[PDB]
Write a protein that binds this ligand. Structure first.
Ligand SMILES: C[C@@H]1CCCC[C@H](O)[C@@H]2CC[C@H]2CN2C[C@@]3(CCCc4cc(Cl)ccc43)COc3ccc(cc32)C(=O)NS1(=O)=O
Length: 156
């Protein structure tokens, strides 16, 4: 019924799990599957670049956060609200939010805390959707995300 939340959670959870495990989830998407598929494909293309372009800053922040367990992962919501929500919103900042989430998810895999990845994805989704719904709706949601990052085919 809250379709934006459900769709956001599915896209973000899939990207974080895919980043952590290195395998695609072959299960069908829920509702709005065509857009969700394209959003995940976009998030791959763009987020993978973001994590490399900001490698030094990402590594620095990860080290600072010292994520070891469920309690540490739970504390991240407050930090996301502080850093992401309290600023002007644009798609770039949303991708950085999600891309750093994937960076944290990979870290969780490396320390054998894979069970924390889904709660992490839920926390990121809560912060994004519950603090930026108005902006997301005005920007056409995940359809807008896909449109914004669409790259035209090169001739020849
Ligand atoms: C140009 C900027 C990107 C480069 C700067 C990156 C920055 O130095 C920190 C390295 C992690 C970045 C801090 N966080 C990361 C943070 C804040 C730290 C905790 C956290 C945890 C998770 Cl699971 C996901 C995100 C986050 C909030 O999300 C951010 C959203 C936008 C920007 C930065 C955010 C953010 O600053 N995005 S931006 O304006 O596009």
């Amino acid at each position: 019924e809250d379709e934006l939340y459900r769709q956001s959670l599915e896209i973000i959870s899939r990207y974080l799990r895919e980043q952590a495990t290195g395998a695609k989830d072959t299960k069908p998407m829920g509702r709005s599957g065509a857009t969700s598929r394209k959003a995940l494909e976009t998030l791959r293309r763009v987020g993978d670049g973001v994590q490399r372009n900001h490698e030094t800053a990402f590594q620095g922040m990860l080290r600072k956060l010292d994520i070891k367990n469920e309690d540490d992962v739970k504390s991240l919501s407050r930090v996301m609200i502080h850093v992401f929500s309290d600023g002007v919103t644009n798609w770039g900042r949303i991708v950085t939010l999600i891309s750093f989430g994937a960076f944290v998810a990979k870290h969780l895999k490396t320390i054998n805390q894979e069970s924390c990845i889904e709660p992490l994805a839920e926390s990121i989704t809560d912060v994004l959707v519950r603090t930026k719904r108005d902006w997301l709706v005005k920007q056409r949601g995940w359809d807008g995300f896909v449109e914004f990052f669409h790259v035209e085919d090169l001739e020849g």
